[PDB]
Design a protein around this ligand. Sequence first.
Ligand SMILES: *[C@](O)(Cc1ccc(C(=N)N)cc1)C(=O)O
Ligand SMILES: [Ca+2]
Length: 223
Amino acid sequence: IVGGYTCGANTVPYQVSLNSGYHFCGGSLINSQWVVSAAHCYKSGIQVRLGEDNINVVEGNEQFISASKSIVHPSYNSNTLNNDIMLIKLKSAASLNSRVASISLPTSCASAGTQCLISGWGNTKSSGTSYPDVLKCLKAPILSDSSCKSAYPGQITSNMFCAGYLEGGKDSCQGDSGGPVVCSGKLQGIVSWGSGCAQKNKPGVYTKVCNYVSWIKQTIASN
Ligand SMILES: *[C@](O)(Cc1ccc(C(=N)N)cc1)C(=O)O
Ligand SMILES: [Ca+2]
């Protein structure tokens, strides 16, 4: 997250870290046994880490649970990033409280103009590298689809939205991929892609979760 603030320990209780020896992508807890992330984050050998704040220190609220199954969207296209969504089932159910909670899936798609909260452990620099150990937050609006398409001609599909600032300086970034964009207390987006980070006229591009709710629900009921 570039240009964001330090969220505060377990203020974002649905936020997970995906670990394979090291944090590689975020994700969101949607019930006590399922996580939704970016299909471009898929690996073998995931451990999900819940209740995290500092990812390098054991501070007391963590639950570390291995994935039993990962399901990438049927139509994910890794050259265009279209359908950049994946479901991860945990080997055991999480224990849910105030500091480890699930986020609701949306009933409606959120509109341009709505202010959202994006969070992760990604890089905090638009030039060079510096990865934080504690969870970073950013508040950012959803952009209009015209503005989005004019930023990324030929690249945006129906299953994407942009959010952020065309002026640059505040964005999500590498490492923040798969993590949540929550608007009015519902999961609206997934950190998907961008051109660099926090650059001028290159906002972040986010998977549009409200187009997948049927697919999530069906999948969860059958697996
Ligand atoms: C991602 O975090 C890659 C990524 C995602 C989003 C942005 C953006 N500028 N909003 C840049 C890069 C990963 O796969 O690690
Ligand atoms: Ca920790």
